[PDB]
Amino acid sequence: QGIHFRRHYVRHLPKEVSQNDIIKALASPLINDGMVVSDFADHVITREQNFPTGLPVEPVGVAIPHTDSKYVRQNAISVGILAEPVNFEDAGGEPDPVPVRVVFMLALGNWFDITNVLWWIKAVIQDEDFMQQLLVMNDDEIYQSIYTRISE
């Protein structure tokens, strides 16, 4: 409800990109709009380097980078669809990486929004049909569907 989700918070990211490239691409609209501090991306990669967020779900791997809420000015989400699977370390203590193709960058400063959005994500990435749609839909349609179900 108090979460800011705009059309330009959805991006398709091309082939040659690394973990740090994705975090910087997804953070870019949030910093431009003032939703986070200027070094928010640094704080995400640092946090990702020590506390991974790769979720090894089928059919498509998912990651959910974020940092401490003190670095968030206003609640927002940024979404990346990866043309190629980029590896993320497993959020649950594995060496086997997670081939991620969907990235949910969370920039939430409010704890009650954080748990609700994580709850929603857990339900959504167990919906194979939905995850399948995210790999074919365009940025506008991805924005429309996600904007609908996080309205509620």
């Epitope: 979720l55 809420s69 003190k70 968030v72 959020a91 939430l108 400063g109 409010n110 704890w111 009650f112 954080i114 748990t115 609700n116 994580l118 709850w119 857990k122």
Partner: antibody, heavy 131, light 109 residues
Framework: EVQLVESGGGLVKPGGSLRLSCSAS????????MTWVRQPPGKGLEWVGR??????????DYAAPVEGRFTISRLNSINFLYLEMNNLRMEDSGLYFC??????????????????????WGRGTLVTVSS | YELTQETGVSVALGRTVTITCRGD??????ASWYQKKPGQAPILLFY???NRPSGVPDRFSGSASGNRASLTISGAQAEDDAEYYC????????????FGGGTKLTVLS
């Protein structure tokens, strides 16, 4: 290193009001959630209320017997937490603890809004309601 | 009480003992566990699925199933003789918190 020094407890009349303070040190207080807990005479710990941080607009929640009579506030510039107790009742008597409050949510098994837990406690300030 | 705990439990020194917290909100929420001695501030022992604060003896372990949360003390010591409180949400999805009634743990001397 963490200290939570409560004060303001003492004798107060039913129907009256009393303000409790707690002075916190040794942690990032600006971003910390803070909780009051009380121990009535001869009973166990009782959750009283909790104030959140800036990301939540400092919203407060209260225990049922206390809602509408107690007000929790904070002044972050001086690392103080406050409990303002109005319309005091005999059963408000007890030892009042201030507690630094953590937040927990497990992704795969969690349910919103997760759980709060009390990672550092003061020694409490004693309140006696009596006419 | 929304969370029910045994009133008192005895354990022989060096033996293992489990105390329990039970309630509907535990089907959706984890519990945290506290130790309190007469006249002293409570201390956090365990919370969440498997989190023990540094400085807490690793003989304290929490677990959970159904409407039940357990704290197990492997090899009880005389310094463990204390009161134990559980805490969790008062109802599933609630922003409020609540404590169980406390268990008096006696380490037989």
């Amino acid at each position: 290193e963490v200290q939570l020094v409560e004060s303001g407890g003492g004798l107060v009349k039913p129907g009256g009001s009393l303000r409790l303070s707690c002075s916190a040190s040794g942690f990032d207080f600006d971003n910390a959630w803070m909780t009051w807990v009380r121990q009535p005479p001869g009973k166990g710990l009782e959750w009283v209320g909790r104030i959140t941080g800036p990301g939540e607009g400092w919203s407060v929640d209260y225990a049922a017997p206390v809602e509408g009579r107690f007000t929790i506030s904070r002044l972050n510039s001086i690392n103080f937490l406050y409990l303002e107790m109005n319309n005091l009742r005999m059963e408000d008597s007890g030892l009042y603890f201030c507690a630094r409050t953590g937040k927990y949510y497990d992704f795969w098994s969690g349910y919103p809004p997760g759980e709060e837990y009390f990672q550092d406690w003061g020694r409490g300030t004693l309140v006696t309601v009596s006419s | 009480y929304e969370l029910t705990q045994e009133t008192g439990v005895s354990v022989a020194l060096g033996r293992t003992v489990t105390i329990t917290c039970r309630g509907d909100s535990l089907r959706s929420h984890y519990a945290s566990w506290y130790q309190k001695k007469p006249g002293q501030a409570p201390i956090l022992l365990f919370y969440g699925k498997n989190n023990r604060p540094s400085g807490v003896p690793d003989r304290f372990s929490g677990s959970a199933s159904g409407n039940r949360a357990s704290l197990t003390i492997s090899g009880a010591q005389a310094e463990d003789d204390a009161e134990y409180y559980c805490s969790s949400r008062d109802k599933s999805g609630s922003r409020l918190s609540v404590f169980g009634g406390g268990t008096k743990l006696t380490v037989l001397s």
